Amino acid sequence: LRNDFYRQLVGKRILIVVNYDIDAICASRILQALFKYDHMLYTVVPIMGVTGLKRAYGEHQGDVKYVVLVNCGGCVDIVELLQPSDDVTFFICDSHRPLDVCNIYSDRQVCILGDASLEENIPAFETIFYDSEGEDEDEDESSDTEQQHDDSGAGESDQEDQAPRSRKLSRLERHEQRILKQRARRQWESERDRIMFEYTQFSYYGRSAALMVFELAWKLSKDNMDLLWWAIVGITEQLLLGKIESGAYTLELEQIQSHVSRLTNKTNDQNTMSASKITFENDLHLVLYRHWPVTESMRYSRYSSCQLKLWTLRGEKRLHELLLEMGLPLVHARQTYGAMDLVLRKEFFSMVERLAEKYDIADIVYGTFTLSYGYRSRYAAADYVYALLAIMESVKKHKTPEDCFLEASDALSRQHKQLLSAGIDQAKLLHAAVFRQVQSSLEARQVHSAGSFFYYVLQEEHAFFSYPYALGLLARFLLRGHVATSRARQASDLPLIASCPLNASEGMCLLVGIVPVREDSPRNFFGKAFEQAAQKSGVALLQDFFEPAVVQLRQSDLTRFLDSLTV
């Protein structure tokens, strides 16, 4: 709730919107709007990393009490992170959910939006910080330390039969005067079975970043159509239930339509140009039905391709055979779908949905929205987001990271669109440059298993694959690629790694972790899994991202680290 706490929000603030994300911008531009509405000046921020965050707060060494960060938080007992915080108001709203408890407790400078059907970690603080063994926060028999310290009367207090609290059992000795430590460790470790179940085996994401924010601003009587679209963007990023889960899809078909359909501000007069209120339809995650012909865009998506195996010829043969049953002309299969004639381009999906039921594909259609600004053309559900990811354009000017962020947030207006087509173009060329490596690497047989996983390494830098989003995308097209056709049915289920050269950064051999096949809810080990070898030998590793599934190494200090990381 903040139908009460929002009424705190008038004084000065800082609105930080942590490292690059589509949840980020969609969730934050609305609040920029909200906050120049009630006549507040504030601060939006680019985040380059947790160090970027810490210097940022360092540069804002004031007493801005209404500090705000969003889509982060699980890093420390962040009073340890952020010492000078005294009673300063922070707000966490992150869906990176497996977060510390010291950030949850200490009801001082934090917002426990603790609301979940998992009441599983209640004494998770009641024994690690509250108990201790072989400790110094205590007294001694001598008269020089005759003062009572922060006596928790627990293992946090002494273990020499000095514990006024801890009134479950005997006092002097259970079997010995220090069986205190024995039972302390019993509970400690027997329930580190569940502490190590947290944060040291697996990570995930939770819920939205900004649909809660839509309901917040909905209670103040705003029917901002565009805010529905921006939140739609925020979700349709990791609506990708194979990437990171939505789940609620068939429940949000009630939720969001109920937000928007039932309140019909015009039921009879809406046949107008500007922003004719949003609609909903059941369509695909075929990449880019609209502005391209079929036959290139039927070819660069993984799911349409992997099930029909087109990077070899034979897939094209069966492809043509299904265009045959579809009876699309090849010319028409090479003019833009919109550039087609009428009747075919109307009936296209109408036929494809039902007579693809019978030929190896079942999971291409979705439920989404689309709308006009005017009479130019009818933009698409995600063709923003696949234009966005192409704006992470790590050029060597050193300004372009933050500048491309600022550009991106200045994109989803109804105004700036000469760039949006730019994003489309950039996206397409990268999208088929993805495919351009798979044939090279598959049929060169670069699929290094090397034991319990599959593994890739690469050799030099591409501007595609300088940054790691494209890298995860590489790994997540090859994987299906190889494991369709080179295997029996036994070994299709193992995880994957991939090197990522950075000729820019003096030689670091970046990596990204990614998971085996077809287990949507059973997600990453790699919330910590890499860190094993970090303990065993341990060499210059990083975990800088609030994204977990990533590292950054030296050019060449990986292989032995990998041999340790065999297990």
Partner 1 sequence: MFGEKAFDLLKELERSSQTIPAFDDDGVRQVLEEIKAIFEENVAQASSYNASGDRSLWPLLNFRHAALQRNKRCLLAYLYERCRRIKALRWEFGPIIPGDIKQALCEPEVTFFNNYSKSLAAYMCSAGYNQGLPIDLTNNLRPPKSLYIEVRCMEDYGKFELDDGEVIHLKKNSQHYLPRAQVESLVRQGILHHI
Q: Interface with partner 1 by CB under 8 A: which residues?
A: 11-14, 39-44, 59-62, 64, 406
CB of 63 to partner 1, least distance (A): 9
Residue 461 to residues 125, 207, 509: CA-CA distances in angstroms? 46, 35, 10
Name the amino acid, one letter, at 478. Answer: L
Q: Which is nearer to partner 1, 44 or 457 (CB)?
A: 44
Pairs from 210-217 (Cβ < 8 Å, separation ≥ 24): 210/23, 210/26, 210/27, 210/30, 210/234, 211/235, 212/93, 213/27, 213/30, 213/31, 213/93, 214/30, 214/259, 216/2, 216/6, 217/30, 217/34
Bridge partner list, 70: 17
CB of 14 to partner 1, least distance (A): 7
Q: Which is nearer to partner 1, 10 or 355 (CB)?
A: 10
CB of 84 to partner 1, least distance (A): 14
Q: Which is nearer to partner 1, 46 or 293 (CB)?
A: 46
Q: Report the 10 Å Cβ neighbour count for 514.
A: 20
- CB-based contact 412:26 (threshold 8 Å): yes
Residue 319 to residues 279, 339, 365: CA-CA distances in angstroms? 32, 21, 19
CB of 495 to partner 1, least distance (A): 41
Contacts of 399 (CB under 8 A, 6+ apart): none
Q: Which is nearer to partner 1, 65 or 277 (CB)?
A: 65
Q: Which is nearer to partner 1, 12 or 480 (CB)?
A: 12
Q: Which ranges constitute the DSSP H helices of 238-333? A: 249-260, 294-297, 302-306, 313-326
- CB-based contact 502:470 (threshold 8 Å): no
Q: Which is nearer to partner 1, 31 or 306 (CB)?
A: 31
Residue 458 to residues 274, 465, 501, 550: CA-CA distances in angstroms? 49, 10, 6, 16
- In the chain, the N- to C-terminal Cα span, in Å, equals 45
Of 120, 288, 317, 96, the residue nearest 206 (C-alpha): 96
Cα separation of 88 and 231, whole Å? 29
CB of 59 to partner 1, least distance (A): 5
- Any idea how long the chain is? 567
CB of 39 to partner 1, least distance (A): 5
CB of 393 to partner 1, least distance (A): 19
CB of 13 to partner 1, least distance (A): 8
Q: Which is nearer to partner 1, 44 or 433 (CB)?
A: 44
Cα separation of 172 and 178, whole Å? 9
| Number of alpha carbons in the 13 Å side-chain half-sphere of residue 108 | 14
Of 42, 18, 58, 15, the residue nearest 405 (C-alpha): 18
Name the amino acid, one letter, at 315. Answer: G
CB of 52 to partner 1, least distance (A): 12
Apex CA 88: angle with CA 84 and CA 91, to 5°? Answer: 120
Q: Which is nearer to partner 1, 11 or 374 (CB)?
A: 11
CB of 6 to partner 1, least distance (A): 17
Q: Which is nearer to partner 1, 43 or 162 (CB)?
A: 43
Q: Which is nearer to partner 1, 68 or 104 (CB)?
A: 68
- CB-based contact 548:525 (threshold 8 Å): no
CB of 20 to partner 1, least distance (A): 17
CB of 24 to partner 1, least distance (A): 16
Q: Which is nearer to partner 1, 58 or 374 (CB)?
A: 58
Q: Which is nearer to partner 1, 341 or 410 (CB)?
A: 410
